[PDB]
């Protein structure tokens, strides 16, 4: 009984763990995209400033 209960609880708990892992994957994808745009703009402005004198 304990062995079966342990296996079932493990199944549930790690399904929930995968849920939260996916949630973090989403939020970090969004944060990566924001940093991508920020980095591109920041790097580009250096070229602009160099060229503008």
């Amino acid at each position: 009984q304990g062995y079966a209960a342990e296996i079932s609880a493990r199944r549930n708990a790690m399904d929930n763990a995968s849920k939260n892992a996916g949630d973090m994957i989403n939020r970090y994808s969004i944060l990566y995209n924001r940093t991508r745009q920020a980095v591109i703009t920041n790097e580009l402005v250096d070229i602009i400033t160099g060229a503008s004198s």
Partner: protein, 475 residues
């Protein structure tokens, strides 16, 4: 001497020789009937920004001077019709009547004349009315994402004034101005149709610097609309102005600045952008009885991306307003509309100007709902605490274009807070609310007159409403 000749033109910018007597930011008018603002003086030339399209000017054209700084017609003659920037009528209904003309860029009133806000902007939205009250003269940001109902929050508020602008006296009146920046012209057409289908257009003004207008018109329009509202403010009538939305104004100013080759700042926005919004939004105020008595109140709108309130423009604007409402997209697509994120939504002064009865019944409901959020993330009593929160989150919902008078909001909020709704089936709450008001309209109606007229519940009426709510729950 008076009139110059064009040396160059392109990107919406021009340079003109002559114009020796021009004031800074004076309106020039070109040979082709387009108008421009003398933005950048220098020895031997004037750099000018065209309000019209670039195609309308040629080198060698001869340029006239208007003689006045950027200015708009003002007064109730504008009331009830659509206008483009510079006060151009576009409703096809004929010329604008005017009480006078005022510069688009008057300085905001100083520290002394102002008075702390003490009167309510009647929302018509339950959550806004109870949790984030807005006082006349306050500046409350509405911030959100695409299609998350940003326009609706302001539109319900504009419509709700119907019950008072028809009133017997100017005391409670609240005139309305709506400013569309960079929007689809079809959106402005349909919105004007919505406001004309209701009575609202009888007392409101629409400024429509839509997407096709060259950048300087989009840049200038909010100042001109504010200058219209300030006439109502200074003549002792309250005025509410709305902007959908100031982010597109920031984009227009970014385009205009970069074409002037000014340095690009953080996030490619010009460093001046902070000034642009601030000198606008500071013009909303409430003036003490020493200089007239009235208010200009503002609802700017900001379109976030992915809920990133931490982006440059969102934070920059938040640094100026006296409050914010953050419409969470997840709550919208969860079906919880108007999706106010009660945790981050803030009113920095409204609690001192909320209509007293609604505060009296609400009794710190804001922290209660924050507690409900804290519980919902995951003891038996801790579980029970969630049930009344679920009832309340069901009850706060409201459909578009159908406001509630305060006399209707107060009973519902009272029933939610006291828990008399906790026993009721959660799914039937929408049936209950519409029903309870009906009951109030049929039997207790005198109580509805008392709550509406007095502004506070008396202890006798507190017990009476407890009895009435328990009776309807018994039904």
């Amino acid at each position: 001497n008076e009139t110059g000749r064009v040396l160059a033109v392109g990107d919406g910018i021009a340079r003109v020789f002559g114009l020796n007597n021009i004031q800074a930011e004076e309106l020039v008018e070109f040979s082709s009937g387009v108008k421009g603002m003398a933005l950048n003086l220098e020895p031997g030339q004037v750099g000018i920004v065209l309000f019209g399209s670039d195609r309308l000017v040629k080198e060698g054209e001869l340029v006239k001077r208007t003689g006045n700084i950027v200015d708009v017609p003002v007064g109730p003659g504008l009331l009830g019709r659509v206008v483009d920037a510079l006060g151009n009528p576009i409703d096809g209904k004929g010329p604008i009547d005017a009480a006078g003309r005022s510069r688009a860029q008057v300085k905001a009133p100083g520290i002394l004349p102002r008075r702390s806000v003490h009167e309510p902007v009647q929302t018509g939205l339950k959550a806004v009315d109870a949790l984030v009250p807005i006082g006349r003269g306050q500046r409350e940001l509405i911030i959100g994402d695409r299609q998350t109902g940003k326009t609706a929050v302001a539109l319900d508020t504009i419509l709700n004034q119907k019950r008072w602008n028809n009133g017997s006296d100017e005391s409670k009146k609240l005139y309305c101005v709506y400013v569309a920046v960079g929007q689809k012209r079809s959106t402005v057409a349909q919105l004007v149709q919505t406001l004309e289908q209701h009575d609202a257009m009888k007392y409101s003004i629409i400024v429509a610097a839509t997407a096709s207008e060259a950048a300087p018109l989009q840049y200038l329009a909010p100042f001109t609309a504010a200058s219209i509202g300030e006439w109502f403010r200074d003549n002792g009538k309250h005025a509410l102005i709305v902007y959908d939305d100031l982010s597109k104004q920031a984009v227009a100013y970014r385009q205009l600045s970069l074409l002037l080759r000014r340095p690009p700042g953080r996030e490619a926005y010009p460093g001046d952008v902070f000034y642009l919004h601030s000198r606008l939004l500071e013009r909303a105020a409430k003036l003490s009885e020493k200089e007239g008595s009235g208010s200009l109140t503002a609802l700017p709108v900001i379109e976030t991306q992915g809920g990133d309130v931490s982006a440059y423009i969102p934070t920059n604007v938040i640094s100026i307003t006296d409050g914010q409402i953050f419409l969470e997209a997840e709550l919208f697509y969860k079906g919880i509309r108007p999706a106010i994120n009660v945790g981050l939504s803030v009113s920095r002064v409204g609690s001192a100007a909320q209509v007293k009865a609604l505060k009296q019944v609400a009794g710190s409901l804001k922290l209660f709902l924050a507690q409900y959020r804290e519980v919902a993330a995951f003891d038996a009593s801790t579980k029970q605490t969630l049930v009344r929160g679920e009832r309340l989150t069901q009850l706060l919902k409201q459909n578009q274009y159908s406001p509630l008078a305060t006399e209707e909001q107060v009973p519902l909020i009272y029933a939610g807070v006291n828990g008399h709704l906790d026993g009721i089936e959660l799914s039937r709450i929408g049936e209950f609310e519409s029903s309870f008001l009906s009951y109030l309209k049929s039997n207790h109606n005198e109580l509805l007159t008392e709550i509406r007229e007095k502004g506070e519940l008396s202890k006798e009426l507190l017990a009476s409403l407890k009895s009435a709510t328990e009776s309807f729950v018994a039904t």
